[PDB]
Design a binder for this molecule. Structure first.
Ligand SMILES: CC(=O)SCCNC(=O)CCNC(=O)[C@H](O)C(C)(C)COP(=O)(O)OP(=O)(O)OC[C@H]1O[C@@H](n2cnc3c(N)ncnc32)[C@H](O)[C@@H]1OP(=O)(O)O
Ligand SMILES: CC(=O)SCCNC(=O)CCNC(=O)[C@H](O)C(C)(C)COP(=O)(O)OP(=O)(O)OC[C@H]1O[C@@H](n2cnc3c(N)ncnc32)[C@H](O)[C@@H]1OP(=O)(O)O
Lengths: 171, 170
């Protein structure tokens, strides 16, 4: 499957009929809100797409600028380096892969693409890392295996991947 | 141009000894904290610099990713377009010009550069506009005069410039 990742095109001429990641909220979001919030500067959207005449959308993700409370950091050493109430961040608002193509590493590949975008962004604007709220335990284990660190307590869904680690990816 | 704007270089070999914008907190921050928070990915810093062998720094600013309460926006209609409690933003943490070159448009020129950077950033990551807390009434009038919007109430120092306005500039 020769799939490619792109920012969602202005025309949004994707074939999304039948898209189902197995979580209805993210299926509905793709259909109703992705493009409008992208054009409204609430998020920016990226799509994993096929090479058909009308490219089919097989996955997508969204990024928004954010910040989060310094106290959520597990390392009190890192906390002492943040001289303000909040640490700056980018939030992975949503990530979803279509059922037809799950379990092959496409989810992993989208996260790698996220990392490169956030890395580029971190050079121009202060971004201490990538923040994500795991939607459920299945998603949480997914992010933990990719190396995300746990914020707050051991049963919180708030995870974080530091820019310091992102830059190590692209040396 | 006589002075040029750049992201602060990794070596930070700028001559900052004589810098004085007239607010001691912003002078002290330049000297003690700017470069280390830039390297710490807390902010990214940009400087207005001369062309001497050791470049002299005549101004600087910092940008950090952020978000802010949707309720801050004055227009209840605009609030309905933001489907969450917080709107994504970039914060202008600091902006300062050395007194020797204040009143010549350099502050305005730095803000324009800010907007250009924020505009580029908004293409890749969702950013609803540029957030700033004015340090004092003098700074507040400066940003209002460049077209920033008053958030909360007429007596708050929280101001905002929407990406929608930035796009019209560019
Ligand atoms: C903010 C949020 O919470 S986003 C929430 C995430 N999204 C959702 O919950 C919606 C529904 N879920 C999904 O869309 C998907 O399940 C996702 C995005 C969470 C995971 O996407 P997937 O493509 O299934 O993940 P990915 O295939 O990268 O996971 C690795 C698995 O693929 C297998 N795999 C096969 N080939 C490869 C490869 N080349 N590289 C890596 N992994 C591979 C591994 O065996 C591994 O299996 P295991 O995890 O069962 O041990
Ligand atoms: C988050 C923060 O950093 S807010 C803190 C702001 N920084 C400071 O207070 C530090 C000390 N001050 C400074 O460094 C500078 O005085 C600044 C940044 C506030 C202003 O920069 P300057 O270079 O002096 O301003 P510049 O000459 O570019 O002014 C451009 C325009 O703004 C206007 N302006 C500037 N200050 C004011 C003011 N206090 N009231 C009204 N208008 C003003 C000017 O009149 C000019 O408009 P015009 O061209 O139509 O006449």
């Amino acid at each position: 499957q020769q799939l490619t990742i792109e920012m969602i095109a202005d025309a949004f001429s994707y074939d999304i009929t039948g898209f189902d990641c197995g979580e209805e909220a993210l299926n509905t979001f793709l259909k109703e809100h992705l493009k409008r919030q992208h054009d409204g500067q609430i998020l920016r959207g990226y799509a994993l797409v096929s090479g058909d005449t009308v490219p089919r959308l097989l996955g997508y993700y969204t990024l928004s600028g954010s910040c989060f409370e310094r106290g959520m950091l597990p390392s009190k050493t890192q906390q002492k380096k943040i001289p303000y109430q909040n640490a700056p961040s980018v939030t992975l608002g949503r990530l979803a892969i279509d059922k037809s193509v799950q379990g092959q590493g496409w989810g992993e590949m989208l996260v790698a693409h996220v990392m490169r975008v956030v890395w580029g962004a971190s050079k121009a604007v202060g971004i201490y890392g990538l923040f994500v709220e795991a939607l459920n335990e299945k998603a949480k284990a997914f992010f933990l295996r990719l190396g995300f660190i746990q914020l707050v307590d051991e049963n919180s869904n708030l995870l974080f991947y530091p820019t310091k680690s992102i830059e190590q990816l692209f040396t």
